Design a protein around this ligand. Structure first.
Ligand SMILES: NC(=O)c1ccc[n+]([C@@H]2O[C@H](COP(=O)([O-])OP(=O)(O)OC[C@H]3O[C@@H](n4cnc5c(N)ncnc54)[C@H](OP(=O)(O)O)[C@@H]3O)[C@@H](O)[C@H]2O)c1
Ligand SMILES: NC(=O)c1ccc[n+]([C@@H]2O[C@H](COP(=O)([O-])OP(=O)(O)OC[C@H]3O[C@@H](n4cnc5c(N)ncnc54)[C@H](OP(=O)(O)O)[C@@H]3O)[C@@H](O)[C@H]2O)c1
Lengths: 256, 257
């Protein structure tokens, strides 16, 4: 029997296409987002088209009580063996046009909620010796130049967390994937007050998810569909380790 | 007249040494942390020894009302021209031993509060055409191997935010520095349930801060005192840009069909 997949941000975009795709592979699903009505239509379609069980679970992951209720479900339901931590939003406007409320929301959703859901399944996954956590990062986490300083910071967070979780949890049989899209045709752009049609280039959501799932089936750790030269990843990671090899912690460097 | 410095996490460790050092340079100070009694003693010492004004400002930066009150003070007080976003904590235990409450606290302090205080001064700094934001990251943000997956993530956040803020704000005359210590002899270790004496090597807090301040005086963007070969930073940043140069966004790469 195939594991049930809990997907956050399942109501649209990358989340919704993951849901469609996993339903077509034969997995039962738990779909979470705020828009209950839209989730109930999507769930019904997938139950009908694919014959799997699909539950629509309303939750605002920036509301403490909703998040806690999703944590509970992840801790307690042994059927759930794949977590897609996909729910996320971009930044609207530059740094000075940010608000305290907006910063709170962006960080809580993209970072705190994602990390907490992963922490809700990890103990159970360790005990069973199996499980999968797919975290959606972004190419923007490599690009302070893109101009979304906070959002990009949240996505650097998600990449790093994913790397760290792999090292901690793969020895207990857990797969931890970071998936890093670049511009993809979803509701994120309009949510942030950007017209998606003004971006030079944008990937279709079907093509991104199928690429991501090729990565998933190969059990790839870091999956970057729009990166046309794979070895740039290895070179980035090498330079990171290279830097780490020349840390001497007892004394400040001569130049200081 | 020299700008007043607001320092978070001023009651001990790196924050407290920054406070001592900036007081000796002649700056007035606003010191923030939870331990009011300890802040009042430090403030009194610095007023007496150095003859600058020093205000002790109690705040738990994980409590919404306290954080909002510090934001207000940063927005409204034109004297404050340097922000040291130093308050932070490490992770206690591995990922499976984490708690919802502990995750909330660690991320809120190291990330949300830091970002919000920076956002509280930036508009005023942009308007005045001057100002400085010093964010304390960590070498651990380069090291998923170190085993603190959440804490390290918060420090990858702080580095990235710093880089982004530099590009957004230096054109308006703002200096944004990321300071990245490695193991340094402060209260962070005991807070996390680690005996600092079991670490192979640990830098004295005086030496770290003085190194950081050499960086600050040279207006260096990314300052990593324990990195003995500077060019490893440039090579990391190059590889990052190298990767960015080979992103083609319309189509998935051949290896994914
Ligand atoms: N260009 C791209 O699309 C792109 C590129 C790289 C990475 N990403 C990442 O991809 C992920 C998916 O976003 P998308 O592109 O698929 O955008 P999307 O169409 O806006 O989907 C976002 C999903 O997250 C849910 N969500 C938003 N706020 C929420 C909240 N407070 N609580 C619970 N759920 C919430 C949304 O449903 P409700 O609004 O009904 O809650 C929606 O299903 C994000 O993490 C994003 O950072 C996107
Ligand atoms: N090895 C290292 O020490 C090392 C290496 C790299 C980076 N860092 C970074 O250096 C920074 C300073 O830490 P440290 O090494 O100096 O440790 P520290 O001695 O524990 O100092 C932490 C300071 O932040 C304050 N703080 C803690 N929780 C707080 C809260 N909720 N609200 C407001 N303030 C709070 C503390 O005072 P109260 O508890 O009285 O509130 C204290 O003044 C951190 O951002 C840390 O991540 C440290």
């Amino acid at each position: 029997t195939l594991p049930t997949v809990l997907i956050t941000g399942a109501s649209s975009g990358i989340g919704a296409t993951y849901a469609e795709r996993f339903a077509r592979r034969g997995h039962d699903l738990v779909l979470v987002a705020r828009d209950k009505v839209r989730l109930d239509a999507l769930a019904a379609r997938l139950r009908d088209e694919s014959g799997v069980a699909v539950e629509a679970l309303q939750a605002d992951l920036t509301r403490p009580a909703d998040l806690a209720a999703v944590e509970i479900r992840l801790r307690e339901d042994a059927r759930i063996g794949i977590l897609i931590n996909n729910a996320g939003m971009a930044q609207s406007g530059g740094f000075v046009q940010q608000t305290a409320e907006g910063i709170e929301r962006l960080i809580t959703l993209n970072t705190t909620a994602l990390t907490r859901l992963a922490a809700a399944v990890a103990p159970r996954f360790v005990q069973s010796g199996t499980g999968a956590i797919v975290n959606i990062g972004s190419v923007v986490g490599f690009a302070p130049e893109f101009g979304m300083s906070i959002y990009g910071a949240t996505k650097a967070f998600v990449l790093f967390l994913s790397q760290g979780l792999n090292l901690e949890l793969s020895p207990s049989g857990i797969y931890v994937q970071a998936v890093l899209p670049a511009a993809t045709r979803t509701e994120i752009w309009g949510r942030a007050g950007i017209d998606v049609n003004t971006l030079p280039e944008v990937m279709e959501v079907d093509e991104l998810v199928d690429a991501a799932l090729v990565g998933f089936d190969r059990r790839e750790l870091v999956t970057i569909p729009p990166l046309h030269v794979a070895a740039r990843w290895d070179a980035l990671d090498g330079a990171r380790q290279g830097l780490m090899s020349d840390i001497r912690q007892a004394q400040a460097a001569d130049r200081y």
